[PDB]
Scaffold this active site. Structure first.
Site, PDB file in Angstrom:
ATOM      1  N   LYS A 141       5.624   4.967  59.256  1.00  0.00           N
ATOM      2  CA  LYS A 141       4.938   3.762  58.797  1.00  0.00           C
ATOM      3  C   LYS A 141       3.968   3.201  59.832  1.00  0.00           C
ATOM      4  O   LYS A 141       3.258   2.236  59.534  1.00  0.00           O
ATOM      5  CB  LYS A 141       5.951   2.680  58.418  1.00  0.00           C
ATOM      6  CG  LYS A 141       6.644   2.903  57.083  1.00  0.00           C
ATOM      7  CD  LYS A 141       5.688   2.728  55.924  1.00  0.00           C
ATOM      8  CE  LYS A 141       6.418   2.814  54.599  1.00  0.00           C
ATOM      9  NZ  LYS A 141       5.517   2.494  53.461  1.00  0.00           N
ATOM     10  N   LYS A 142       3.924   3.772  61.035  1.00  0.00           N
ATOM     11  CA  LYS A 142       2.927   3.426  62.035  1.00  0.00           C
ATOM     12  C   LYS A 142       1.638   4.224  61.878  1.00  0.00           C
ATOM     13  O   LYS A 142       0.730   4.079  62.703  1.00  0.00           O
ATOM     14  CB  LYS A 142       3.494   3.636  63.441  1.00  0.00           C
ATOM     15  CG  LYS A 142       4.135   2.406  64.048  1.00  0.00           C
ATOM     16  CD  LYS A 142       4.591   2.680  65.470  1.00  0.00           C
ATOM     17  CE  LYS A 142       4.893   1.391  66.209  1.00  0.00           C
ATOM     18  NZ  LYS A 142       5.789   0.500  65.423  1.00  0.00           N
ATOM     19  N   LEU A 143       1.539   5.060  60.846  1.00  0.00           N
ATOM     20  CA  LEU A 143       0.339   5.838  60.579  1.00  0.00           C
ATOM     21  C   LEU A 143      -0.738   5.033  59.865  1.00  0.00           C
ATOM     22  O   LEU A 143      -1.871   5.510  59.746  1.00  0.00           O
ATOM     23  CB  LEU A 143       0.687   7.075  59.745  1.00  0.00           C
ATOM     24  CG  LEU A 143       0.815   8.409  60.483  1.00  0.00           C
ATOM     25  CD1 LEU A 143       1.060   9.543  59.499  1.00  0.00           C
ATOM     26  CD2 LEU A 143      -0.422   8.682  61.321  1.00  0.00           C
TER      27      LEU A 143
END
Ligand SMILES: *[C@@H]1O[C@H](CO)[C@@H](O[C@@H]2O[C@H](CO)[C@@H](O)[C@H](O)[C@H]2NC(C)=O)[C@H](O)[C@H]1NC(C)=O
Ligand SMILES: CC(C)CCC[C@@H](C)[C@H]1CC[C@H]2[C@@H]3CC=C4C[C@@H](O)CC[C@]4(C)[C@H]3CC[C@]12C
Length: 538
Positions: A171-173
């Site tokens: 989800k940090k992408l």
């Protein structure tokens, strides 16, 4: 094979490293219920007779009265005391699970990515044989004392803390409470299960007597030893069919399309921190009076206790249907409540999130269908959000600018102050007409056209384009520019006296409100001496 799989997942493992995690989660849910879950502050939150617009997940979850709601956090604390010790563990988990997922499903604003984890880790540990080592059930039952537990007690728990560590990387992408301690206490699950037999060997001999048993663990009933049964086979339908949804529910957004929105949607199971870039320069609740058609510009946050109802479409409809029954108590029989919420982006790009012409009371919102009355974020204007740096770098420090995006049929009635002399407009995309109500003259603007505005007056900029029109407000505060032209060893002691107020106030107020069920209600002047007895500093 399938019979070879269940024999792998029900293989006898050591029960000790699970039993530290049963303690360090059962102990971190003793510190949690006063501090974060709100046992210190139920009185202002679920007060009797107070008109508050709740935000539950299911709309049939009506909260109990405050006399009963101090019992629900007590069963949660009787449950998290027997899950600490390991005492009566198949009852002390259901006494912590069912009044957690009644509390956690009662407040959608209270969802985040650590208080959803404890609702998960109390769901796995209910079905798990965590009370085999270092318990009170072991000191009362012989066959629950230091006995081998199946591998799906460890494969699920190594698979839950994997996914939290994995999806938060994926989800940090594109002040967190106990979360910094549970993930430090959960890290001895990934180690070998022999680790609570290693440090006791580093301990002295006389310290080994109050520490639990050090010998080799006995076999149990709940395993498959070198064909499995009904208890054994459901440990293979819980190792994967639970871990399948834990790989699926963070990406279950496209099926719950009534919940999802521009950025996050229904926060909770996402595993990614929410951004505070909105900052919300406007709300304008505009209800139509029943039977007269009169206009009432209501205050924004009247019957709520959190500001999460403006950033999301689900909590708005529950707030628009709770206001639809409260307003008859204030001579508004049938309200037609229209929300006008300008969600602002980090410094510019002010645009609406909900349709201000539609009645949010009556307009249909289904949890899996697409929400109709949500205005889309203009992602074509995100390259224009790179075009702001072309305008920002070319302009100096004293010219401040915010950007506006407007949809057809709408208008932004903005008041230029007396401070904001030399204020101009530039319409970039679309076609709008600016009309100064003090001057009573329309003026249709073209694309790229520059036009000044008078200070100290209102102005209304109407959108006549069929496309979403966008423009910008360069302004200078001329009067402000004319003003320019002329110890650690005592902090923790202060932290300790803060937290001992939390433990004292939550413990005292619980026994007061538990008296009303068993011993009946006292007099109003009696309890007044009792409630100020708790609110003092010890
Ligand atoms: C400037 O012209 C616009 C465009 O006609 C006017 O906006 C309309 O006003 C009427 C009556 O007030 C409304 O019924 C329409 O819905 C408005 N159009 C839109 C797109 O909202 C506007 O009123 C004029 N300016 C002033 C100050 O009267
Ligand atoms: C409301 C009172 C009576 C308690 C009823 C129990 C219900 C609401 C609770 C207890 C435990 C909860 C489950 C716990 C774990 C999960 C996994 C999560 O990823 C999705 C929700 C789900 C599947 C929950 C569904 C609802 C649930 C079954």
């Amino acid at each position: 094979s399938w019979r070879r799989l269940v024999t792998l997942l029900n293989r006898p493992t050591d029960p000790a490293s699970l039993a530290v995690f049963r303690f360090l989660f059962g102990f971190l849910m003793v510190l949690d219920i006063p501090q974060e879950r709100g046992l210190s502050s139920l009185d202002r939150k679920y007060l009797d007779g107070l008109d508050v617009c709740r935000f539950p997940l299911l709309d049939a979850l009506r909260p109990l009265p405050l006399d009963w709601m101090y019992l629900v956090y007590t069963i949660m604390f009787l449950g998290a005391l027997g899950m600490m010790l390991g005492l009566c563990y198949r009852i002390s988990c259901v006494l912590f699970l069912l009044p957690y997922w009644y509390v956690f499903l009662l407040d959608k604003t209270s969802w985040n990515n650590h208080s959803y984890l404890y609702g998960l880790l109390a769901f796995q540990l209910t079905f798990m044989d965590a009370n085999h080592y270092w318990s009170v059930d072991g000191l009362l039952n012989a066959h629950r004392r230091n006995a081998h537990v199946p591998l799906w007690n460890y494969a699920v728990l190594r698979g839950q803390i994997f996914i939290v560590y994995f999806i938060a990387g994926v989800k940090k992408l594109d002040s967190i409470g106990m979360f910094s301690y549970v993930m430090l206490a959960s890290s001895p699950l990934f180690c070998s299960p022999e680790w609570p037999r290693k440090l006791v060997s580093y301990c002295p001999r006389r310290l080994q007597q109050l520490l639990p048993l050090k010998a080799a663990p006995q076999p149990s009933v709940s395993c498959v030893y070198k064909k499995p049964g009904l208890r054994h086979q459901l440990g293979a339908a819980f190792t994967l069919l639970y871990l399948l949804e834990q790989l699926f529910l963070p990406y279950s957004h496209f099926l719950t399309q009534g919940y999802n929105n521009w950025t996050n949607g229904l926060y909770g199971y996402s595993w990614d921190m929410m951004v505070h870039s909105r900052s919300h320069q406007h709300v304008k609740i505009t209800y139509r009076d029943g039977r007269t058609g009169e206009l009432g510009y209501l205050n924004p946050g009247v019957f709520t206790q959190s500001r999460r109802w403006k950033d999301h479409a689900d909590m708005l409809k529950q707030y628009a249907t709770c206001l639809s029954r409260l307003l008859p108590k204030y001579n508004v029989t049938e309200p037609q409540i229209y929300f006008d919420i300008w969600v602002s982006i980090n410094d510019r790009f002010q645009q609406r999130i909900f349709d201000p012409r539609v009645d949010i009371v009556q307009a249909a919102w289904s949890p899996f269908q697409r929400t109709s009355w949500v205005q889309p974020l203009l992602m074509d204007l995100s390259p224009w959000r790179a075009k702001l740096q072309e305008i920002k770098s070319s302009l100096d420090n004293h010219t401040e600018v915010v950007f506006i995006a407007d949809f057809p049929g709408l208008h932004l009635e903005n008041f230029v102050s007396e401070d904001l002399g030399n204020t101009s407009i530039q319409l970039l995309q679309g076609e709008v007409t600016v009309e100064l109500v003090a001057e009573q003259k329309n003026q249709t603007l073209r694309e790229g056209e520059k036009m000044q505005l008078p200070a100290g007056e209102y102005h209304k900029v109407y959108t006549t384009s069929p496309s979403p029109s966008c423009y910008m407000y360069v302004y200078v505060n001329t009067t402000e520019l004319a003003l320019e032209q002329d110890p650690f060893h005592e902090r923790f002691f202060r932290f300790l006296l803060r937290k001992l107020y939390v433990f004292r106030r939550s413990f005292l107020m619980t026994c007061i409100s538990l008296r009303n069920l068993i011993l009946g209600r006292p007099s109003l002047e009696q309890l007044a001496q009792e409630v100020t007895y708790a609110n003092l500093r010890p």
